[PDB]
Subunit: 299 residues, 4 copies
């Protein structure tokens, strides 16, 4: 667990930009990668939930993976979310991530169909084998996956050979603390941005988040406030992140983030794929004012 | 709603046979269609959940759809489950179903990501458009999709232009009755085989089910018993169906069904796709005895 | 299970009438018991959830039990819901029901606090002991108790020495059928009036319900329709019951029932105890119209 | 919200000691109050969930209320949990708390029966009126009450006239932050001991908890650590608190705490009321070792 310490940190869950016809916008994808590097992030998490993975084909996900590796390999840590319901499809994306030079792969607990815990473990084992020597990030998101793992099951997942981290998109900070106590060296990512400060305090040593794409310096600022023992500053930063998250929940989270990035002249086209609707017109002024606030807050 | 009475009835949710390398077993697929026709079913529902749709590519789902149409068009009713999370993927499968001559399409409420009710309606509207004049079956399965529709939302979905039926995989038989009372003409399929008789009594006029692939005549028998007013016979048939479903839950439902069909010399290979494990050896004897029992019962 | 067949049937879950100051209305309680006897019911279930047991003191519940025994002992079957969270409180009510001559006691699974299955079993054993020879009805209502029993745990409860029946307030009619199949002689009451017909078909042999207080003959008629094999009549009667239940849900179920009974000249004051609010004025005309319809419906 | 700052702090949810026959052990109750005062706590919360309020009579709860006031009035803050399902019963306990000189009352959202939000509000208004001048603490515990309040409803509850605080027994630290942000002056108690440190960081300014009865100085130490910016010390204290909570979850929480207190020579008899079972013999060694550790840690 200590030989993959380079995986710790704050890493945006990269959005996948699409063009006006909902195809991959490669030029905007490259700009978004460069924008995140310039924000000072530790890494990027590609083709996750926030990446709209589950409305893309395998070929599209591979194209995105390869472009991001071109832009970012050697500059920041690269984690490829390869997870699919199908084990064989996940293996194909893991083998591709290996060829592109990613530092780690990740896979969401396979969803829709009920699978036994043993089926989950063999799924991770098969993907780890196809990753062919780069570590696995187990990705736990019970609210969307419907997979309700016990603590003892999480303990077994994160000790499988080849697993180097846990992305913990759970609001249960008792379990966060229990995972940390059971695995003092484990790379443990907070997945709910709206509790980032509290999740670090409960044992996470970094985070993977959708909203880091537009204000990663606030989350980096919370990491530093807590190291410096400035708890009032950590709370103030989290209050500001959550004011933004309240707005994003009102307008649509992924499309709201893409719209801000469009007003920051990063993404040419801010659409999500159907069935996500476009942003309602009445919310544009607020999203544009947020973009301008965030740009001014950097200098 | 009156012009789609030809969609009523008992229709197996067709399994998708795979070979030893987990590719589509076309020969076994054709024999499973013929086998279901020979059982006297009213139709087949292709590429659904039971069909392992969500561990298949679009290309594979199209291949299955086209094969089934070749075997069954003009002999029994053909319903194509074209549903994906992506609207555009679902539309591609709907346009393909239209080319192959299917009698209706169907789509599960798109899952994993939370979508507004308005986003769900526009998803169905777009698929109905690509289906280009064949009716849509709305497919409600809250336990796996995570979409919890109210009665009033269901009422709006089943009256969208182009919607001709509802696949109701819900054990809430108060809602089943309310849907029937609000739409006396609606084609309404019972989706949980283990309550078929009660679901008919609560208002369903047919059923779509995984276990109909191995014993459709029991469910046709329940329809008949209730029409005849032999409530005791309906109960006894459901008891026997549920003894089977108990066994299938113990061994794994889709792989148990495929194993029974392997022991009936229908499918050459009884595998599901990973991450479904194969059947445990200790259950083979029971599954073989069930196939023997069902074959002697047939005649 | 053979020697308690006299418990089978259709039994209203008796409302507890209160007066203007929210004290027990003894005269209206007597009139409601008599009204139910004249409706032809098989028994009465006293001091249950519908009886507002959990906003009453033990002394008040005992006074209600004794009165119902005076009015109904030897005329219809008498079941006393003695259940509390506390085991000793429940035992006090069971010992009292024994003194008053009840034919059976009943206890809801103790709630609010999480208790282990063994703690639940010991709770029932102690109450059965204090009931001193009259059988126990296990009362299962997960939606309000939060106790989620497995099928195998239900199998152990209904086989405790002294248990003669199960009140099954669950809409899961697979489990209903499984209970019937494992216990062919068990007295099994359908608890959700809105699926009564389907619940009988799935294996219940009677019911306990709040709405039987105002229209027991429809549920008795459903029993008769199914015995006769008139499945269409059973459905039509269930439709009519559910039209009423729809209204009761809109206005508040217990207070709406009490208001109907008020307009039938049975109850002097149609209030529930606080924090239940009174019925909104806008619903009075509907409730009065339903009272008239149910009265004309009888003769 | 500012004129009740004397309610902020760290307050054990007092256990109710019972004797060998399950009646109130008055002598052990007095020594438990004194023990907590001597731990440096800010107040005590009397007759709550932890106090086994819902297996006691109104008369028993008043006896405990009156004894605690006699021991602690004017030494530490006194909060009386007067909550019942019944509004009238809750009012009776609030009038008593007022007579005994309590500083505040509290009530759990009424449970078991579904009540509307307006019925909850009127319940609190009525108790506040009977409390006759002392502030009300709204007490939120969705996991046991089943009352799932939105954020906007919580906002309306804490702005009711006479409401001075919220006991927030929720693990959702997004909502915790949102409440703090919407009400910067609100007295906001963290209810889940196992996330205390994180709950403070998310906006709580105190806590009410069952495990404070045996180790309040750890929780006071966490407050001090977070004020001093020693995040690492706060984390270590929370780890130790959670090692204890793990053991208490394994043995049974209330009875485990009382057993520890017995081995601390505080409680003569460590029994909870039925249906809580006694502690298993095989856990006694661990609970005794824990008692010894906590005693030696104090100094
Ligand atoms: Cl290749
Ligand atoms: Cl490359
Ligand atoms: Cl699982
Ligand atoms: Cl830290
Ligand atoms: Cl820029
Ligand atoms: Cl084409
Ligand atoms: Cl929805
Ligand atoms: Cl029918
Ligand atoms: Cl006595
Ligand atoms: Cl008597
Ligand atoms: Cl349990
Ligand atoms: Cl029958
Ligand atoms: Cl009168
Ligand atoms: Cl008095
Ligand atoms: Cl509510
Ligand atoms: Cl603080
Ligand atoms: Na890095
Ligand atoms: Na047909
Ligand atoms: Na009787
Ligand atoms: Na104080």
């Amino acid at each position: 667990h200590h030989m993959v310490s380079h995986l710790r940190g704050v890493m945006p869950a990269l959005l996948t930009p699409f063009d006006a016809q909902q195809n991959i916008d490669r030029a905007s994808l490259r700009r978004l990668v460069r924008f995140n590097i310039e924000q000072g992030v530790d890494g990027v998490y590609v083709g996750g939930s926030t990446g709209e993975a589950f409305v893309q084909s395998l070929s599209e996900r591979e194209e995105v993976l390869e472009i991001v590796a071109e832009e970012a390999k050697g500059k920041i840590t690269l984690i490829a979310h390869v997870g699919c319901v199908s084990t064989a499809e996940s293996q194909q994306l893991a083998a591709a991530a290996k060829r592109y030079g990613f530092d780690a792969v990740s896979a969401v607990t396979p969803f829709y169909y009920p699978f036994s815990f043993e089926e989950h473990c063999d799924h991770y084992r098969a993907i780890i084998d196809s990753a062919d020597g780069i570590p696995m990030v187990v990705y736990n998101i019970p609210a969307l996956s419907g997979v309700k793992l016990t603590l003892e099951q999480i303990n077994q997942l994160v000790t499988l050979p080849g697993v180097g981290a846990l992305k913990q998109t759970s609001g249960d900070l008792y379990q966060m603390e229990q995972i940390r106590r059971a695995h003092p060296e484990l790379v443990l990512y907070n997945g709910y941005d709206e509790i980032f400060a509290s999740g670090l305090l409960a044992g996470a040593d970094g985070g993977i988040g959708s909203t880091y794409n537009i204000m990663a310096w606030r989350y980096l600022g919370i990491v530093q406030a807590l190291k410096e023992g400035d708890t009032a500053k950590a709370q103030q930063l989290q209050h500001e992140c959550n004011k933004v998250i309240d707005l994003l929940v009102k307008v649509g989270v992924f499309r709201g983030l893409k719209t801000v990035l469009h007003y920051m002249d990063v993404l040419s086209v801010p659409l999500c794929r159907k069935p996500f609707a476009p942003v309602e017109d009445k919310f544009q002024a607020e999203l544009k004012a947020l973009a301008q606030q965030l740009m001014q807050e950097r200098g």
